[PDB]
Homo-oligomer: A and B are copies of this chain.
Amino acid sequence: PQVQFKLVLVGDGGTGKTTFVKRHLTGEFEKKYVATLGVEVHPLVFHTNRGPIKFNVWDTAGQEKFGGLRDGYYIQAQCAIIMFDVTSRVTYKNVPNWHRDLVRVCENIPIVLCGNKVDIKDRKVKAKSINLQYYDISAKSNYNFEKPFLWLARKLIGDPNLEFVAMPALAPPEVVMDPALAAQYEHDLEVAQ
């Protein structure tokens, strides 16, 4: 009717939120513009071993640069991704303010934290510094694209072993993610935790 969840995607302007949600090609083709709220809702369908799951992802039209988001933006949000930019420290320092802002209005919805732009070698916010699951991502290479959504699916459904059996069509990568860098970053996280 179906199995559908509103997901709010928040975090400073310029962190890559729009870029990230647009990797899902069908959700971009089927996006709905919400005139009264300045939002595009992207219906992202994923396919698990137990069937389809739909995340309706709310992406701002950039107003987080100029002020706070309306309440209507947060109404009936059932999960969230907070994004930051791994090359801009201010964006990471605001994460607790995005986190509180969400909490104040939600609350105890599952939240994933994503550090975007890990494709850039010149990284400022490293693992040492970093239900609040973390992933390194690179929107422009699709690196770790599935992970936030898989983790949120496993948390929402209550199945720790849920898997995506088929990947959605994703925008061709516009940037490369060096797999050896990805392994070094994986190791840094393991040596933080």
Binding site for B on A (CB under 8 A): 2, 25-26, 29-30, 45, 47, 49-50, 52, 54, 160-163, 165-176, 178-180, 182-184, 186-187, 190
Bound form: Cα–Cα A190–B175 in Å: 28
Bound form: Cα–Cα A108–B132 in Å: 40
Bound form: Cα–Cα A49–B168 in Å: 17
Bound form: Cα–Cα A8–B67 in Å: 50
Kindly name the residue among A163, A167, A169, A180 whose own CB sees the greatest number of chain B CB atoms within 10 A.
A169
Residues of B within 8 A of A174 (CB): 176, 178
Residues of B within 8 A of A161 (CB): 183, 186-187, 190
Contact call B179/A176, Cβ cutoff below 8 A: no
Residues of B within 8 A of A176 (CB): 172-176
Residues of B within 8 A of A168 (CB): 26, 168-169
Per CB-CB distance, the 9 closest pairs between chain A and chain B, nearest first, are A166-B169, A161-B187, A49-B183, A29-B52, A49-B180, A165-B179, A163-B183, A25-B47, A172-B179
